[PDB]
Structures are given as C-alpha cells and as structure tokens.
Amino acid sequence: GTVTTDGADIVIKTKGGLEVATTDKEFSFKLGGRLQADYGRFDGYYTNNGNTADAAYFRRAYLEFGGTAYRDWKYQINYDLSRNVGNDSAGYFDEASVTYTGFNPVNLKFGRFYTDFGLEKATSSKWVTALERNLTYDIADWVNDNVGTGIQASSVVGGMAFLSGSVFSENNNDTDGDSVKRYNLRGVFAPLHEPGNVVHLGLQYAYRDLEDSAVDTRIRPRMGMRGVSTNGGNDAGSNGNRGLFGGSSAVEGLWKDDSVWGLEGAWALGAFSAQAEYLRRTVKAERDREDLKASGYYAQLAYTLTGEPRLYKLDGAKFDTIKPENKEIGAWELFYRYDSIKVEDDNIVVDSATREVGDAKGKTHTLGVNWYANEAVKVSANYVKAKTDKISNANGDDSGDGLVMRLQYVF
Amino acid sequence: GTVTTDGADIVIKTKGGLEVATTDKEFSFKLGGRLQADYGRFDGYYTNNGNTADAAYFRRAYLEFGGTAYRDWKYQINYDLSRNVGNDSAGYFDEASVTYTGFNPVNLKFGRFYTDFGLEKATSSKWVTALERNLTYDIADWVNDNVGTGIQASSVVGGMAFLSGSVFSENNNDTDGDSVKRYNLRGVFAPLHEPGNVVHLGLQYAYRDLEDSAVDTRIRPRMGMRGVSTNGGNDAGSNGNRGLFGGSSAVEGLWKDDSVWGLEGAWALGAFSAQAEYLRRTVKAERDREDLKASGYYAQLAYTLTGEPRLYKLDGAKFDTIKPENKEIGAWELFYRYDSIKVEDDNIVVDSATREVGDAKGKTHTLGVNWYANEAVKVSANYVKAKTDKISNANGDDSGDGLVMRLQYVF
Amino acid sequence: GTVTTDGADIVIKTKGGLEVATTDKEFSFKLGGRLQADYGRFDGYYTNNGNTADAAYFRRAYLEFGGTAYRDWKYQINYDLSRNVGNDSAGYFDEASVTYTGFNPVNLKFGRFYTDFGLEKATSSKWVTALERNLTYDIADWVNDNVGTGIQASSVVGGMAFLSGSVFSENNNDTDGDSVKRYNLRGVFAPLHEPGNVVHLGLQYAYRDLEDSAVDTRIRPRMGMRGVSTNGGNDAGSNGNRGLFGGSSAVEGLWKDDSVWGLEGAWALGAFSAQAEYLRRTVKAERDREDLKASGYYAQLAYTLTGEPRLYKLDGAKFDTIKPENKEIGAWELFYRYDSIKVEDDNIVVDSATREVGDAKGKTHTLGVNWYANEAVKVSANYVKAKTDKISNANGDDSGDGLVMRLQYVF
Numbered sequence A, B, C: 001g002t003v004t005t006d007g008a009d010i011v012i013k014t015k016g017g018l019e020v021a022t023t024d025k026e027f028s029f030k031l032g033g034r035l036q037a038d039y040g041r042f043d044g045y046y047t048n049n050g051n052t053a054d055a056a057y058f059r060r061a062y063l064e065f066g067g068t069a070y071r072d073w074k075y076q077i078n079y080d081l082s083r084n085v086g087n088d089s090a091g092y093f094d095e096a097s098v099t100y101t102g103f104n105p106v107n108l109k110f111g112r113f114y115t116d117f118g119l120e121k122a123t124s125s126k127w128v129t130a131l132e133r134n135l136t137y138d139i140a141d142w143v144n145d146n147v148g149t150g151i152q153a154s155s156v157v158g159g160m161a162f163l164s165g166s167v168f169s170e171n172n173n174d175t176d177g178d179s180v181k182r183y184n185l186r187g188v189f190a191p192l193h194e195p196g197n198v199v200h201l202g203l204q205y206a207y208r209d210l211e212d213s214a215v216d217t218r219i220r221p222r223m224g225m226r227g228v229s230t231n232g233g234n235d236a237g238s239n240g241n242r243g244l245f246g247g248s249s250a251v252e253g254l255w256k257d258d259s260v261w262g263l264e265g266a267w268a269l270g271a272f273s274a275q276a277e278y279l280r281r282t283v284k285a286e287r288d289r290e291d292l293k294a295s296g297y298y299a300q301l302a303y304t305l306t307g308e309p310r311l312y313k314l315d316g317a318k319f320d321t322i323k324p325e326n327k328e329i330g331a332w333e334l335f336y337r338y339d340s341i342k343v344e345d346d347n348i349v350v351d352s353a354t355r356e357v358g359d360a361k362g363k364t365h366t367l368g369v370n371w372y373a374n375e376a377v378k379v380s381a382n383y384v385k386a387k388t389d390k391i392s393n394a395n396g397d398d399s400g401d402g403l404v405m406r407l408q409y410v411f
C-alpha cells in the first residue's frame, strides 16, 4: 500500500532511529538514543587496598525524544536508563527542555539542561574525545550540571561569536525552602569556526549565593576512572577509592557564596586539534571558617589518523562528531589529555592515614584511541595514569593505573 | 527514495510526535507526551515558618505510547518520567491499559487507569483549566486514583448520557494479603454535549470494604500549591507545610468501610463555562473509634477572551482542549475557582501546636490565565489564596498566598 | 501530501507498534513492547497463614527499541516499566545489547542480555507456554539471568545445530572489587527444526569462581506462583510465603565455585509438543562448610486444539509464537507442566517452624489454557498445585493451590 499524509509533505529518515519532518519546517519528530558500554580495570590509588578492581556498566543509556511544532517551538526529552544522571525524585533526566526560537538569532531555553560552562561539557557526550570528561569539572561540578530547572538565553553574535547566560533554580534549599539561584555566563570569540579550521577563545562565569543554605561541597574526584563508583552495572564497590580532596557535607550556614571563573581555548587545523580549559573557584566561608578554593586545567591534543576533522558548531561553541570517509575502514583517532587540579581547604588541620594537611593535588595522563566504525558505532580504549599529592588510598598509594574500553552505539 | 508499506494504506502525521495508521482502521500507533514545567513561590500557611519558599519542578513528564491492533484491541502506556504518579515498586504509570471495543457501544478497559469519579479528574491533565485539580480530591484520594489494577466498563447511552463502572484491586492488603476491592460507578446526563453548548449533570459513587485492611487515610491537602511537596525537581523541602486535616496511618483493623457520594454539574455557552462538584465521604470506624468524615465542593468559572469554546466529549463526560483561532496571537483564557473542604475526625481529642480539636476546614480562591500559544504550547499563571480553620502552620498562620507559573508542551 | 525519504527506499509497517526499514537491508528501526497484566489468587503453602491472598500486577511492561545500522550493527534496548527485572542502580533492563553480524554465521553480542542456558528461557517471554517459567531456574537463577554485562558468540552450525558461549561480568564482587566472571556454554542438535516438526537435544554448562566473593545463594522458589512476591502492582505482601529451600546470604568467603550442567529435549508433531529440561548444580563450600547442591527437571506437554504449531527457531534453539489460522475464533492451546526440584544444604542442622533437616523438595502441577485472539492479544489461565517436603509455611501447610489469569498485549 501507499504512505501519505494529511498535512504538508513529510520526509522520513532512519539510521537506526527515526526522524519525521514536514518539508515546510513547521513540525518534526526525532527518536534517538545512545548506549555506552564500558569495561574498566584499575589499581593503586583508584582502589582502597591498591589491588585491581573492575567495572562493567553502561556509562549512559539514553532514549531521546525531540521535535518541533509551529516552526518556533522545540522540545527535547532525554532519559537515562543507566541511572547515571538525575535521581528517583527529580527524575533521571539528561534533558527535559523547551526552546523558542522566535527571537532568532536569540534562543530561549526552559527546563532541565546543563548550564553552559566549558567547551568539553558543551560537546555532546557522544563525541567527547576521552571516555570521561576532564578533572576540572570534578572540582566545580555545579557550574554545568542539570540538577535543577531554569531559563537560558543564547545567541550567535556577528557570525563570529557565541553568548549564553542562565538563571537556574538548584535543588538546594535555604532554611526557608527557597532554592539556591545559580547564575551563568559564557562568551566565546571564534573568528574561525569551521571543521578543520577553528580558533576559539572562551570566558565563563558562575555564581550562587549560599547564605543559610545546605549544599554538599565535598570535592571527590574519580581521578579519570569512572568505574571507582558508578551506576549502570557494577563498579569497584567497597574497594573503590573516591578520595575526599576537601569541602564539607550539606550542613546549613557553612558558606556565604560560591564563584567560578573559567578561561578556555581551542585550535583546530585539519585532522589536528588542541583544546584547554582553566578554572578557579572560591567558596567564601561563613563566620570563622576558612574558604574552600579549587583550581585546575586540562590540555588535550587529538589527531584523526584517517584525516577527517572534528565537527565544530559556533551555535553552542562546541566540538561534535567525526564522520568517517572510508566506509570499510572507518575513522581512527588518537588523543592525549593532561589534567591537573589543586584543592585548598585550610579547615583541614590534622593529618590522617589518607589525607595530609595542605593542598590536595591530582594529575592524570590519558592516552587513547577511538575507532569510528561508521556514524552509529564507536569503539574506544583509554589508558589512564593518576598521581596525587597529600591524598592517598588506605594502602598509602598516591598513584594508580587504569585501562577502560567502550562500545558506543548511537541512533 | 520511496516510502511504501506491504499492508493496507498508511497515513502518517506529526505535530511534534508521531501517528501512523492504516486507513482501514485496523492498525495504528501513536507516540506522544506532555511536559509541564512549573515554578511556584508561596508563603504563610503554605510553609512551616510562614516565610517564602519556592518550587521548580516538572509537574508531569509523560512519554505516551498507544495503538490499535485488529481493529478492536487498543493499548495505552503512559510513563511519568517526573515521578509524580506511581512508585518504584508498582511502576511510575499514568496509564497502562488494554481496551476492547468489540462490544461497541460498550467498551471494556483492563489494567492500570484512574477510576472514573469526577469531571475535573476525567478531563485530561493537559487541559485541566487550573494548574492543580480541586481540593475535594485531596479529601477522597482513593476514589479516582490509579493505585491498583482493575476492569472498567463504559458506554455512551442514547446519545445523551454516559455511564461507567469498575472493580479495582487496590495496592492495599488485608491481613491475608488479599487486596482491598474498590467499586466505582458514574453516570452523567448531558442532553447538550458540544463545544460551547453543554448541559452536564452527574452522579458518582465509590465504595471499598476495609475490614482487617491497612490503608493510609491521612487527609493532607496541599491547599492549592503543589510546590509544598512534590517530585520532579525541587520543592519547599523541610519548610513545606502539608497539613494533616485528619485520618490515620495504614494500620490493619481501624476501619470497616469507606463510601463516597458525588454530585456534579457543568454548563457551557460559547466561550463561557461553569462547573462544580460536590462530594461527601464516610469512613466507618471499628471498635470504640470515631468515623472519619469529609465533604467539600469547588466551583469554576472560565472564559476564553478570544472566543474559543472548551471542547467537550460525551464519551468520558469530560471537557478537553482549546484550539486557537488566530495563529499569530493564540487563545487567551481567564478562570476563577473556589474550593471548600471540611474534615471531621473526632478521634482528635487534644489540641496540638498546629491542630485544634474540632472540624478542620480549608478554602481557596484561585485566579488564573492560560495562553494557548498554539495546540502544542500553553503558558499559565495562577494566583492562589488559602484560608484554614482549626489547622495552621508552626508559625500559627491560617492564611497563605501563592503564585505559580507553568510552561506546557504537548506532542 | 507525500511521504518520501532522501536515502534508500523505505518500507513502514504497523501492527500497533512501528517498523521502518530501508529495502537494501542497511538501516532499520523497530519500536514495540509487551504488556502482561496478571491476576492471581492462591492459598495453603503459598501464603504464611494458609489463607487466600491475591496479586494484581504487571508481570512485564516493556518498551522495546531496536534497529540496524550499516547492515551489520544491531542494537536492542528493552526497558521494564513494571520493575520486575533489573534494579534502580544498574537499570531496569530486560535487554541493552549491541550485535555485530559481520562474521555471519557467527554473531557477536555485547552488553546486558540473559546468558544462554535453557530452552524455556531462550523462548521469548511473550510466547512461553506457561504464565511462569519452570522451577529449575529458581534453584540456579544465575545461569541465565542478565544481572551483569558481557560478550556472547553464537552460530547456527551446518543447518542442524546451534552453539552459544559467553563470558559475563556479574554484579557480584570479590574483596578487591573485581567482578565474579560467569562462563556459559550451550549446544543444541536439532536435525528437525520446523514448526510442528522438531527434534531437539541440548547440553548446557555454567561456571563461576566464587573465591573471596559475596554472592546471595539463597534458594527461594515462589513454587509456581508469581503473586507471592512481585513488583508491578500488588502481591501477597506480609502474607506471601517465599520459602527458603537452602543457601546463604551474601557473606564473602563462604564458597569456592558454582557449577551447573543441564540436559534438554523437545519434540513437536504438528500441533503437539513435548519439552523437558534437567539440571544439577553444586556450590563448593570453603573451610569446614557443606556444599550446596540442587537438582530438578520439568516436563511440558502442549497441544493447540485449533491445529496451529508453535514456531521453532534453530537460531537460538527456541520455541516462539502461535499464529492463529481462524481470524474470528483465534487459536486455542492447552498445556500441562510438571516441575520437580530438590535442594540439599547440610549446613542446616536444626529444625525450625518452617524447615526440617534434610533435602527440601518441591513439585508443581500446572494446567493451563491460552487463547491467542490474534497475533497481538493472548488471554491465559493457569491452575497450579504445589507440594513441598521438609519445608512449609508458618501454618504448617506443605501444599498450596493457585489460579492465575493473564491478559497480554504485544506490539
């Protein structure tokens, strides 16, 4: 039989998922998703006793529902079946947003989404080069999380720049049950913004007033290995070392406010790219207590051996996918990332078996390969070496090694 | 390329979601949903200390899958990603049902669905005029909840009336682990049943035998502000006052049975509509205990400034959507609702800090505006004023104010 | 309007769900699901006091997403909304897998799937003849569960046989946080493998090293009645007897290893089929403790009164659906299953109120009828009679009776 429509002409597409769209741009629907299956093995600092643990789990398992109605109104609902983002009271959302669009070039986004701070975070988790995002997000995780609901405005400006800003109602309350309000700004100058020709300078700022609020400020980096503690399958369990670098449990009235500044750069030329982000955080303490300070950076270099550039999008100021040219071979990509963090918490005044008085430091070397078999499937492996200072596992190790592999299917 | 089918002719449709159906009425599939993002601020009675709290949350985030097979067999599975209906044992279902239509005009529905009691409850939550349903459902929660599994028969009768009835296995057990069985009946005479031309008179009854059964009978109305306590994001937390009007926790053998009678009326002429429901509840006590009695009503006036009538459907005896006439400006609707409830629990014999001996009373005034931007998008604001008698917050407040806004997207 | 595509020609299908596929076999998407609504009533051994309990619940409520990309890469994501498989840490997955078929006839499967042990488990839960799978799986539930992540290879061999093997990272850890590794093998010789013409002989083996691991080894068969303890609705709650036949809670260091051997057969002559499985399990104990041993079998006879054979698939070595010949009548099927299990746990050295020293035994007789209304809808009733030895409920009953009905809708 035939397949017709009552309304405007429709075009349908499938690469394993589904797209249906009217040709007049008025209405559309997209059903997609991503599955990331990880297996990692790790030892030393990463585990409590320093022996090898493992983790087999889905890093992400999203079902993704998006569409357009009446040209200017869009929605996106991405739900994480692996339970690695969200919780069972707010919901396991990667995203639940509505966007208008009508004030083009200015876009207005409402709902649950990650606030815009950082190039690596802006980049789709399908296409982040490394298997895990950088260490600096571990020391300031509120700046670009989606743990709340808000409103964002964004615009490409003068065809060479991108600006975003939001107010976000966090799921942290003050003593009156009034939510902590988070403010974000991000501005990117990107005078070259094509795949294989990117020059990117970004500045970003986040602020929240913490007065009379109960907020968890414990900084507990996994140090580049997800499997020390993760949902989606299994992890190192009771032998996983997720060490406390500094900060406190959610006790009301410990802090005044929390501020983060970030500077970022990226340069892409053909198959080569370099990117780096630096951030500085200060949590101002209340009455007699000491401030919590944290800073860090990462630098990443990447090279597609098969020649294809990483996609770049000025709208969002973010990298994206690699589309393989050779349909049999696929695309092959090598990368290296260096990460370095420092946490200052002078509230820590006595030594322990795992924490020495002074600044906790962490650094990682990540070396990896991505095989893009095609636009649906990506197979990856990362070697990670961690080194810490003034923090260790219970065994006294200040270094650890890990190897993680991932099978990714997107539709 | 071409798009064809190997069965009967298919028609496809998208307005943000997806519909695929054979033109012989034999098979169909519909994927849709609804996202309701709320932000509320509220004080006085609504909070424990009387100060202003807020709540940013999804009221609902449904993914909706429905279809038809072999003409006469329908299914509908609606899942709440916002976690506001259901739980993590029974499932977060808005609906999971199978309908057989072969005995048309009689329909048979099986599974998890809300039992049919009340016009406002029968009305789709997409199209309920106010941001929250009326206070009388707070005093008789069980009469129209979906907290169980059952069988329902319903029919339009003589083109002028609607009847439904169900037996429902509640998720409440007696001492033998046998489920409380819930019985529902509803009958509506609607001699006029078209948009802008409605005369609706309804009677409804609900009964359950509670002998040796553990059932939560606590009546804890939110008093017209969802944000005092809700899933889907954040709420007033430890400062949210959800006051106990009466009733008891789930203990086996406190009660003999539970009966509810309801009367309802609705009238529409063009863009104006009025609707009202009254209910009376008695829970018969065992032993030397006193009965639990509750009664209440609401009345709602609504008017579409732009002239469009509310849709009305005789099948279900329910109001429905407003379709905007003007594609540029959309439709604008004003409404007022008055709610009034009374709870009599003579088991309460001593005063407490928030509850006086005697009948607890609550009334609200709700004033609101809906902008239907188009058939996908509705933006709303409600102002709510509450007044209680013999119940207060910890601050001794018996009045509260709230302002709540919603962005809704349906597909 | 028209419906077109910009890639290869597409065929779309709906029977309540959706399929979309390119005619060159390169890309496809399939959205489907299954809803199984059960109502059971049961007494005697099945309940703690021997009185009648009930259970109204969804046995399964899967949404099913599957597809193909670039010909050789397949995914399948099945999520259980009824909460009866998986958990809220690993996810409620029936399946989350990627299959590479490039090495055809050898298929490679990655992710979360049931390990391949047993004909009745290989059979889709849509088409399992009885409402609940056999008792032998209750005594060795790890051999074919999906509580972990792994890799499986499988192949039809020489047009007359099927072989599968896997390694599976279990969600059980040793003291180092290294997962218990499960190994499976299954081989089936099926020289006749067509509907109504089946001769099936299979051998299967499962092994896991449990050294220094914490694993729940409690054997707690429901004895043929799901309703004693289930998610998806309601169950017998505090009056549900799920008796402990033997084994221990997850204490690290109790066991050395766990081995299961299985033998199976199936025979089909037109509308008649017979199938049986036998298994034996030994959990070797550490240090001064006694081994846990379990063994059992089931035998099932099935006959389609209306004449249609059960489908059989050599790829997977499994039975499948019945496709009704009479559009009006549908298909009618009768079956009888006998199940018999024995659990030997010599660590039990003193009598209790519910358990006598010696081998715990259980046997069931299941008699049932299936009405396949059409290919989407199946209505079922099973009568179950249980008999136990050396184990009872608190009332002292060693026999129980149950009647369960199901409405199933598949799309």
Ligand SMILES: CCCCCCCCOCCOCCOCCOCCO
Pocket: A100, A110, A111, A149, A150, A151, A167, A168, A169, A181, B037, B038, B039, B056, B379, B405, B406, B407
């Ligand atoms: C101190 C300011 C805090 C404000 C935080 C608000 C976060 C709540 O976001 C929920 C979104 O719902 C808002 C509803 O308004 C929709 C308006 O849409 C109009 C589009 O043209």
Ligand SMILES: CCCCCCCCOCCOCCOCCOCCO
Pocket: B110, B111, B149, B150, B151, B167, B168, B169, B181, C037, C038, C039, C056, C057, C405, C406, C407
């Ligand atoms: C000796 C009489 C025992 C029977 C007492 C039960 C009377 C009440 O019956 C209510 C049955 O509830 C039906 C619930 O079924 C819901 C599941 O729907 C799926 C149908 O297979």
Ligand SMILES: CCCCCCCCOCCOCCOCCOCCO
Pocket: A037, A038, A039, A056, A057, A379, A405, A406, A407, C110, C111, C149, C150, C151, C167, C168, C169, C181
């Ligand atoms: C192709 C990328 C790998 C990621 C796929 C996710 C599946 C994770 O499963 C973990 C595999 O565990 C197997 C480890 O077992 C160790 C012994 O292996 C012996 C195999 O004969």
Ligand SMILES: CCCCCCCCOCCOCCOCCOCCO
Pocket: C199, C200, C201, C263, C264, C265, C266, C267, C276, C277, C278, C297
């Ligand atoms: C034609 C197909 C070949 C079938 C061979 C399969 C044989 C394995 O079946 C497993 C069932 O074993 C049951 C053994 O239990 C013994 C029954 O004792 C009853 C004595 O009266």
Ligand SMILES: [Ca+2]
Pocket: B172, B173, B177, B178, B179, C053, C054, C055, C056, C234, C235, C236, C237
């Ligand atoms: Ca029950």
Ligand SMILES: [Ca+2]
Pocket: A173, A177, A178, A179, B053, B054, B055, B056, B234, B235, B236, B237
């Ligand atoms: Ca709040």
Ligand SMILES: [Ca+2]
Pocket: A053, A054, A055, A056, A234, A235, A236, A237, C172, C173, C177, C178, C179
């Ligand atoms: Ca592990």
Ligand SMILES: [Cl-]
Pocket: none
């Ligand atoms: Cl879910």
